[PDB]
Amino acid sequence: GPALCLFDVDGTLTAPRQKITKEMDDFLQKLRQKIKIGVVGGSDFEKVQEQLGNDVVEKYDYVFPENGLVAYKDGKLLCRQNIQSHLGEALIQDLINYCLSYIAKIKLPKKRGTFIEFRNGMLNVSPIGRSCSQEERIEFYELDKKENIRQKFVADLRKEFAGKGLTFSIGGQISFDVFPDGWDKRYCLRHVENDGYKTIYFFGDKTMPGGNDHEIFTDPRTMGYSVTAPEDTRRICELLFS
Amino acid sequence: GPALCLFDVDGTLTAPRQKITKEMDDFLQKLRQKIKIGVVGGSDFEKVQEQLGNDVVEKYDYVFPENGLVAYKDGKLLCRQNIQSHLGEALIQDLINYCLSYIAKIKLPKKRGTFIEFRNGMLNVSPIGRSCSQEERIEFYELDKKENIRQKFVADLRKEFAGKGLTFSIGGQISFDVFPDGWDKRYCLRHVENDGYKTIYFFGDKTMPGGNDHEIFTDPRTMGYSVTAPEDTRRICELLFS
Numbered sequence: 001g002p003a004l005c006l007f008d009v010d011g012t013l014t015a016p017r018q019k020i021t022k023e024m025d026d027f028l029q030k031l032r033q034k035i036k037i038g039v040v041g042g043s044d045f046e047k048v049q050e051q052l053g054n055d056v057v058e059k060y061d062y063v064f065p066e067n068g069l070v071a072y073k074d075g076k077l078l079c080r081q082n083i084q085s086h087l088g089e090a091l092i093q094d095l096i097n098y099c100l101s102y103i104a105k106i107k108l109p110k111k112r113g114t115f116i117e118f119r120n121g122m123l124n125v126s127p128i129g130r131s132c133s134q135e136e137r138i139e140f141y142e143l144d145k146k147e148n149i150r151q152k153f154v155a156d157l158r159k160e161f162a163g164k165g166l167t168f169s170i171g172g173q174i175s176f177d178v179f180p181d182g183w184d185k186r187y188c189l190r191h192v193e194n195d196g197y198k199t200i201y202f203f204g205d206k207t208m209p210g211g212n213d214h215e216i217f218t219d220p221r222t223m224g225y226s227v228t229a230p231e232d233t234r235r236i237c238e239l240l241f242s
Numbered sequence: 243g244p245a246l247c248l249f250d251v252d253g254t255l256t257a258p259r260q261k262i263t264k265e266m267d268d269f270l271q272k273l274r275q276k277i278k279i280g281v282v283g284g285s286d287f288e289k290v291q292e293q294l295g296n297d298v299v300e301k302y303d304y305v306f307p308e309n310g311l312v313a314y315k316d317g318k319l320l321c322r323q324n325i326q327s328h329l330g331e332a333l334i335q336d337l338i339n340y341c342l343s344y345i346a347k348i349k350l351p352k353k354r355g356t357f358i359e360f361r362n363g364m365l366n367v368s369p370i371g372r373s374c375s376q377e378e379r380i381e382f383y384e385l386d387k388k389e390n391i392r393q394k395f396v397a398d399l400r401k402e403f404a405g406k407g408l409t410f411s412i413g414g415q416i417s418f419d420v421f422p423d424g425w426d427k428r429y430c431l432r433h434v435e436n437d438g439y440k441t442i443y444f445f446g447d448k449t450m451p452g453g454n455d456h457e458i459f460t461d462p463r464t465m466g467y468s469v470t471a472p473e474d475t476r477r478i479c480e481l482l483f484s
């Protein structure tokens with residue numbers, strides 16, 4: 001029936017760490033006369049504006065920055081959500097308080113700063129601290145492969161907080177992430193599932209496990225299409241919609 | 243012998259939270275023809291550049307951002323030291339671990355992120371979290387006037403870490419600073435002392451007990467002069483050097 005084309009932004013409509021090109025922006029604006037188009041990325045609205053232009057809200061039918069925690073539909077803000085409002089201040093504080101108390105008892109070679117990074121969609125907890133040098137990151141990534149610091153911290157947090165709808169995910173070199181269950185790229189589906197689309201195509205490049213596109217690709221509500229670069233996204237869209 | 247004029251920036255050359263006037267900026271350059279001049283502030287280099295010009299390192303013979311933990315002389319950066327190297331990783335970790343366990347026990351309306359911010363010449367500690375929004379910032383500032391949160395946290399710290407060579411200072415709205423003893427504005431004199439000068443004048447608008455210009459006004463190496471605004475600094479300098 002009526003369909004929607006949802007795109008990951010980085011890697012799919014744009015080369016990594018690069019702004020959209022005038023040729024792809026035009027391709028999509030022409031594909032917009034055929035089908036309704038929308039974008040989803042984990043970055044704030046200011047980075048989505050640096051990657052797709054400061055007029056993104058008027059050129060895409062849907063804009064879902066921050067995995068859809070911020071949503072725009074037809075030029076207006078549809079919704080706004082953040083981890084503090086969903087989970088409540090009490091539970092937010094109980095999690096921060098356990099994490100600070102826990103990190104204070106970890107015997108590490110070095111401890112720097114920003115042990116807790118409050119993002120609108122998650123909490124990025126660092127035993128060492130995100131403010132550390134790159135040489136200190138590596139020093140902790142190797143000490144963690146031996147003493148399994150992040151694993152034990154996440155396992156004690158899973159035992160104390162996870163019945164409150166919380167997921168814990170070790171990743172990177174120095175931190176793990178604490179987000180409400182389902183606040184990956186899948187969160188954006190709840191603003192398009194009620195708009196009457198018989199099929200919702202989705203295009204992303206990190207569509208294999210451990211990727212930021214994987215969960216939205218594996219969801220039954222999407223017709224997922226893995227991609228490798230923006231030229232490949234224009235290749236598949238020509239084969240699909242003429 | 244030769245002399246040097248050290249100036250506070252905010253409130254001494256500039257008005258509160260303002261750029262320098264082109265009148266005062268051109269007066270200081272007519273004084274440089276007759277005496278080497280310098281500037282010193284608590285702000286990062288980029289904030290001193292926004293107040294005095296992007297070419298400050300070439301308009302002034304000495305430029306001492308971060309109270310001198312970052313120091314420029316005749317355009318080139320001078321040897322540098324940081325809070326980790328001076329205090330040691332053990333005291334650092336012991337202060338961080340103590341501050342973290344203390345913050346986990348404060349009952350606040352809201353807690354967010356970046357409770358500890360590792361800077362070159364100090365550790366900034368926010369009971370609420372530095373990442374807090376402007377609304378959450380005012381909220382904690384007004385509560386702390388009533389409950390004296392910052393005040394009690396600094397009193398406990400002065401006790402637990404007595405004799406360890408650390409000073410504590412509540413400034414602003416959401417935080418307090420912890421710096422090595424002597425790392426106030428006096429730190430910068432280590433780069434101008436025994437450099438040929440027989441007199442080192444200083445000018446500051448906050449030279450009273452508890453101000454950021456106090457210890458460098460009362461330090462014996464200096465010839466302190468207390469000012470009220472940019473126009474008063476002009477008056478004293480025209481009295482001394484004209």
Ligand SMILES: O=P([O-])(O)O[C@H]1O[C@H](COP(=O)(O)O)[C@@H](O)[C@H](O)[C@H]1O
Pocket residue numbers: 366412413414415416417419
């Ligand atoms: O307000 P905050 O917590 O961001 O605090 C900010 O300002 C304070 C002084 O500010 P003022 O002299 O204007 O009172 C500084 O001590 C502090 O390091 C800085 O983070």
Ligand SMILES: [Cl-]
Pocket residue numbers: 113114115116355356357358359
């Ligand atoms: Cl922190």
Ligand SMILES: [Mg+2]
Pocket residue numbers: 008009010011012204205206
């Ligand atoms: Mg991508």
Ligand SMILES: [Mg+2]
Pocket residue numbers: 216217218219220221222223224
């Ligand atoms: Mg699917």
Ligand SMILES: [Mg+2]
Pocket residue numbers: 250251252253254446447448
């Ligand atoms: Mg001042």
Ligand SMILES: [Mg+2]
Pocket residue numbers: 458459460461462463464465466
């Ligand atoms: Mg003096």
Ligand code: NA
Pocket residue numbers: 286288
């Ligand atoms: Na800055």
